[PDB]
Amino acid sequence: GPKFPRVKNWELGSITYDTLCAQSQQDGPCTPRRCLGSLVLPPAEQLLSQARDFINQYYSSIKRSGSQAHEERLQEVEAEVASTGTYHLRESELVFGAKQAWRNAPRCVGRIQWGKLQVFDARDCSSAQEMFTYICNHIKYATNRGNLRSAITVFPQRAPGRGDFRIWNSQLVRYAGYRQQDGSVRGDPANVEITELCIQHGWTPGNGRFDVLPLLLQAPDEAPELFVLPPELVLEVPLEHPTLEWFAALGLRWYALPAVSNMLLEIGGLEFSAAPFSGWYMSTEIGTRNLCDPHRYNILEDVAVCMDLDTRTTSSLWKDKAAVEINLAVLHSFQLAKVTIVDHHAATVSFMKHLDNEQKARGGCPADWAWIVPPISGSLTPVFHQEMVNYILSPAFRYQPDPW
Amino acid sequence: KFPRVKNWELGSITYDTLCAQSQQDGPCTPRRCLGSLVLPPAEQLLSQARDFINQYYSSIKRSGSQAHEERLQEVEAEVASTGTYHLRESELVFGAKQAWRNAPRCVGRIQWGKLQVFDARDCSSAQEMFTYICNHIKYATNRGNLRSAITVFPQRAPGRGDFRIWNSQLVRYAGYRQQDGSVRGDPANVEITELCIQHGWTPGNGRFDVLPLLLQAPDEAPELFVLPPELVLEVPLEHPTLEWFAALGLRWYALPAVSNMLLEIGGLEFSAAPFSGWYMSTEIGTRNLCDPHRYNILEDVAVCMDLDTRTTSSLWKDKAAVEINLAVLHSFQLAKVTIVDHHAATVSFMKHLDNEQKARGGCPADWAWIVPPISGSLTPVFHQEMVNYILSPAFRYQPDPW
Numbered sequence: 157g158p159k160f161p162r163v164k165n166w167e168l169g170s171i172t173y174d175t176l177c178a179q180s181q182q183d184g185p186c187t188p189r190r191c192l193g194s195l196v197l198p199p200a201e202q203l204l205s206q207a208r209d210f211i212n213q214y215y216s217s218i219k220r221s222g223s224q225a226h227e228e229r230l231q232e233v234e235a236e237v238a239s240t241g242t243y244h245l246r247e248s249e250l251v252f253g254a255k256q257a258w259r260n261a262p263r264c265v266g267r268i269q270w271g272k273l274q275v276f277d278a279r280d281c282s283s284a285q286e287m288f289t290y291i292c293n294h295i296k297y298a299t300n301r302g303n304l305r306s307a308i309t310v311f312p313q314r315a316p317g318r319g320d321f322r323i324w325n326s327q328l329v330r331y332a333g334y335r336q337q338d339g340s341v342r343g344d345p346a347n348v349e350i351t352e353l354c355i356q357h358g359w360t361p362g363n364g365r366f367d368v369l370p371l372l373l374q375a376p377d378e379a380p381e382l383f384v385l386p387p388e389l390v391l392e393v394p395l396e397h398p399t400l401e402w403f404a405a406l407g408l409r410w411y412a413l414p415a416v417s418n419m420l421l422e423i424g425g426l427e428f429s430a431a432p433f434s435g436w437y438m439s440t441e442i443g444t445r446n447l448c449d450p451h452r453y454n455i456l457e458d459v460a461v462c463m464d465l466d467t468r469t470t471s472s473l474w475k476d477k478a479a480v481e482i483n484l485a486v487l488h489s490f491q492l493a494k495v496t497i498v499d500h501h502a503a504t505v506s507f508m509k510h511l512d513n514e515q516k517a518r519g520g521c522p523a524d525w526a527w528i529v530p531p532i533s534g535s536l537t538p539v540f541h542q543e544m545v546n547y548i549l550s551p552a553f554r555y556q557p558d559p560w
Numbered sequence: 561k562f563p564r565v566k567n568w569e570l571g572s573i574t575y576d577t578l579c580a581q582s583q584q585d586g587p588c589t590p591r592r593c594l595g596s597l598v599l600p601p602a603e604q605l606l607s608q609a610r611d612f613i614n615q616y617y618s619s620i621k622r623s624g625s626q627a628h629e630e631r632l633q634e635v636e637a638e639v640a641s642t643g644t645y646h647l648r649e650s651e652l653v654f655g656a657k658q659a660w661r662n663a664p665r666c667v668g669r670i671q672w673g674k675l676q677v678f679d680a681r682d683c684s685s686a687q688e689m690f691t692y693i694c695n696h697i698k699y700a701t702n703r704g705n706l707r708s709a710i711t712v713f714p715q716r717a718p719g720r721g722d723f724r725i726w727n728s729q730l731v732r733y734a735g736y737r738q739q740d741g742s743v744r745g746d747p748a749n750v751e752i753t754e755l756c757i758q759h760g761w762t763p764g765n766g767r768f769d770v771l772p773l774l775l776q777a778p779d780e781a782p783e784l785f786v787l788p789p790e791l792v793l794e795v796p797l798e799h800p801t802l803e804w805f806a807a808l809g810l811r812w813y814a815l816p817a818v819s820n821m822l823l824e825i826g827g828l829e830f831s832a833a834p835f836s837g838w839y840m841s842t843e844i845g846t847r848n849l850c851d852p853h854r855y856n857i858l859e860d861v862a863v864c865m866d867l868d869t870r871t872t873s874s875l876w877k878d879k880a881a882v883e884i885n886l887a888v889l890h891s892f893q894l895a896k897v898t899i900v901d902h903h904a905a906t907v908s909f910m911k912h913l914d915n916e917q918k919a920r921g922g923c924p925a926d927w928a929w930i931v932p933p934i935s936g937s938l939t940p941v942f943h944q945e946m947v948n949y950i951l952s953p954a955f956r957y958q959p960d961p962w
């Protein structure tokens with residue numbers, strides 16, 4: 157074999173070599189001495205080289221590498237950087253870079269869909285109010301009455317000196333998290349900080365378990381402004397179970413649209429600090445993490461009690477049984493509501509197909525095993541048995557500091 | 561820089577400083593993380609030896625004593641003359657416990673101080689190896705009240721072949737490859753089954769035929785030894801409420817005993833040093849019975865449960881897996897054979913991380929192996945960051961002897 161990482165599938169006994177990792181510019185958190193793979197948290201001349209590299213990627217993707225148009229765009233980019241210190245992407249370059257950033261995302265199991273992304277260009281936006289209009293349009297298009305469509309809206313890039321466009325909320329849809337007198341939390345504990353920031357900026361808080369938060373939107377060098385989403389814009393699914401009649405009595409619900417709004421989209425050195433993207437949910441994200449994490453809605457015990465399980469001993473597997481039923485209720489309720497959702501078996505089978513597509517197309521696929529393997533029934537899915545090489549390619553979605 | 565390690569459920573942070581003591585490299589580089597991969601002179605020996613002897617005297621709080629200095633002279637003198645040395649029994653005992661302590665893939669390390677060490681370094685034939693192995697099995701099994709143990713056969717020597725146990729575990733069920741591709745029994749054991757028959761074993765034709773042991777003394781053909789059936793404790797599987805489950809005819813053995821790993825202590829290598837503890841129920845319930853390249857019983861159990869098999873979104877696979885794990889726990893408890901479920905095991909591992917943080921400043925752990933194969937995020941270890949690195953004494957993989 158070659159001197160590239162050898163990658164094995166233990167289920168099928170098959171082997172590949174990852175040659176794509178050679179294209180990595182960015183270092184990750186690991187060294188020869190220690191593996192830091194499980195950690196959740198890991199320009200003058202520098203811009204020019206990142207830009208040249210991205211332009212080469214674009215021209216390859218359209219099979220015009222070395223062409224006259226290829227060499228003219230390079231010269232354009234460097235002249236523009238030369239005189240202004242920055243440059244600007246053509247429309248088709250943005251659409252390509254956005255899809256490529258998704259394609260490159262090591263933590264996303266949904267990447268079979270990567271070629272099918274609606275890219276809304278919002279680089280003309282000049283106020284917080286217009287951001288809100290763009291965001292509402294995104295939500296309407298992406299939600300599509302339950303037939304969900306992948307989309308991203310890109311706001312103006314970071315510019316020298318001038319402040320950033322930022323969406324303060326981590327997602328477009330978030331449930332409030334209200335800190336109680338006794339120190340417990342009503343609603344989603346994930347959202348305590350953003351909830352209190354919303355109140356500080358003049359939001360009148362509710363007191364339910366599922367109050368949709370307003371958006372805090374920030375245009376360059378301005379205090380963020382507060383915007384309420386019209387309720388008919390935010391599609392939600394009430395949760396019921398196919399055979400357990402009492403489950404509907406719990407009043408549990410989840411929203412249809414997962415839309416990450418706090419990540420930075422980096423393309424050819426340019427930095428799009430507000431560039432929210434959305435897909436559709438994998439059912440374990442709702443039924444396992446959001447509803448059963450101890451530091452989230454934490455409903456496992458309640459459901460076990462309703463199911464009359466022995467919750468006094470770990471060896472009854474009460475946690476596993478309840479968690480299965482919660483996941484089934486999520487899948488069942490979304491299917492009844494006609495809202496797009498994918499189970500962890502179907503999602504992981506499709507990610508294996510993606511790995512095979514990418515092996516042929518690029519000679520590898522960066523992938524974060526701990527994120528790709530679902531949080532229940534792990535080894536029951538084909539990805540558990542698949543070794544994965546994790547590395548950072550650009551274009552990329554990156555974490556960025558909170559604006560406050 | 562020392563790694564910041566965060567628990568995401570509790571919000572707490574530690575720093576791993578133990579990692580600085582790592583001397584051997586892992587598969588990863590700044591360019592790419594390879595952590596999910598299952599497989600990877602005298603002055604050199606002298607450094608590993610001294611460092612290990614240092615570890616030993618430090619552990620008995622006699623660091624710098626007469627005894628410490630003199631032992632370092634012995635080791636130095638013996639290496640300088642012969643190119644190698646020998647461990648004192650008490651050092652061996654210390655190094656074996658430490659190798660387990662250091663094992664990043666082991667979720668059971670809260671137990672690391674409780675290990676019975678059988679010194680089998682005066683072994684000179686496959687016959688004697690078999691005697692030592694039977695004593696281990698008998699001690700460790702203890703009629704179902706399992707006790708962790710290791711037996712250590714003679715170290716590798718420059719001038720000769722290794723002592724080896726050919727089998728990957730001391731108890732393995734045969735896998736018989738059918739002309740038409742399929743396997744009867746355990747597909748993981750097809751290769752060892754064929755090696756046994758080829759060395760003269762009369763094979764069975766069942767799904768759970770216990771394999772003989774192929775034991776190898778240095779530079780000799782391996783020898784075949786049938787384990788006496790009464791030494792191998794087994795648990796028939798039934799389900800607490802599903803009557804038909806027993807009818808599947810399923811069973812597993814009590815004793816998980818790995819026999820193909822190399823034990824490295826102070827630069828010395830023990831090519832045969834089988835070790836055993838007790839099972840975590842997901843090893844049997846989830847991996848051994850439900851892996852598609854193992855016994856692969858998921859579909860059969862689902863049909864028996866009358867589940868909707870036609871679509872993944874009924875979560876039939878998840879439901880069947882739960883009942884199978886429940887049946888393993890129930891059946892082991894009923895037979896009074898030591899077992900631990902994945903919730904209790906991971907809880908104890910969290911306590912271990914905390915013990916090791918105070919004791920040593922960190923703990924090497926392989927997240928992909930520590931998190932159980934079902935209900936990952938339902939256990940506390942899912943939410944815990946972990947640093948993986950190699951400390952010595954160590955258990956390592958080694959080439960198959962054939």
Ligand code: HEM
Binds near residue numbers: 254435
């Ligand atoms: C089409 C439906 C999609 C499915 C089922 C899907 C599935 C997932 C899942 C299950 C995760 C892990 C989430 C978690 O553990 O909280 C994830 C993370 C990710 N996904 Fe996808 N995804 C989809 C569409 C998209 C789209 C359209 C983009 C971007 C264009 C994207 C980029 C990412 C990124 C950047 C992460 C990591 C987020 C982070 O680290 O916070 N996904 N996705």
Ligand code: HEM
Binds near residue numbers: 663669821900955
């Ligand atoms: C006390 C009872 C024990 C329990 C519940 C336990 C638990 C486990 C589990 C669940 C695994 C992963 C196994 C797999 O996925 O196939 C494992 C691996 C390991 N354990 Fe422990 N263990 C115990 C005792 C021991 C002892 C006594 C030693 C050494 C003396 C040890 C050393 C290891 C090593 C070296 C591995 C990795 C094996 C490999 O890479 O193939 N374990 N153990």
Ligand SMILES: Cc1cc(N)nc(C[C@@H]2CNC[C@@H]2OCCCCCc2cccc(N)n2)c1
Binds near residue numbers: 434441556
């Ligand atoms: C700082 C930071 C930002 C950021 N975006 N993500 C992290 C990692 C943590 C780990 N758990 C919460 C947070 O990640 C949330 C990721 C939500 C992804 C949701 C999503 C997006 C698109 C499609 C889909 N099915 N699902 C940290």
Ligand SMILES: Cc1cc(N)nc(C[C@@H]2CNC[C@@H]2OCCCCCc2cccc(N)n2)c1
Binds near residue numbers: 598835836838839957
């Ligand atoms: C070459 C090689 C050797 C070796 N010992 N292990 C591997 C890793 C593969 C992954 N799956 C099969 C093999 O591992 C077998 C490990 C069994 C662990 C048994 C055990 C020992 C002690 C306690 C316990 N609960 N369970 C590979």
Ligand SMILES: C[C@H](O)[C@H](O)[C@H]1CNc2nc(N)[nH]c(=O)c2N1
Binds near residue numbers: 194196528945
């Ligand atoms: C510490 C650990 O890396 C952390 O809990 C990770 C594990 N795997 C994950 N996988 C996904 N998809 N999402 C997550 O938030 C996490 N959390």
Ligand SMILES: C[C@H](O)[C@H](O)[C@H]1CNc2nc(N)[nH]c(=O)c2N1
Binds near residue numbers: 542543596928929
């Ligand atoms: C490819 C992947 O690393 C492989 O399937 C691992 C994952 N985690 C594991 N964890 C344990 N405990 N045992 C295993 O065999 C494995 N297999």
Ligand SMILES: [Zn+2]
Binds near residue numbers: 192592593
């Ligand atoms: Zn790594």
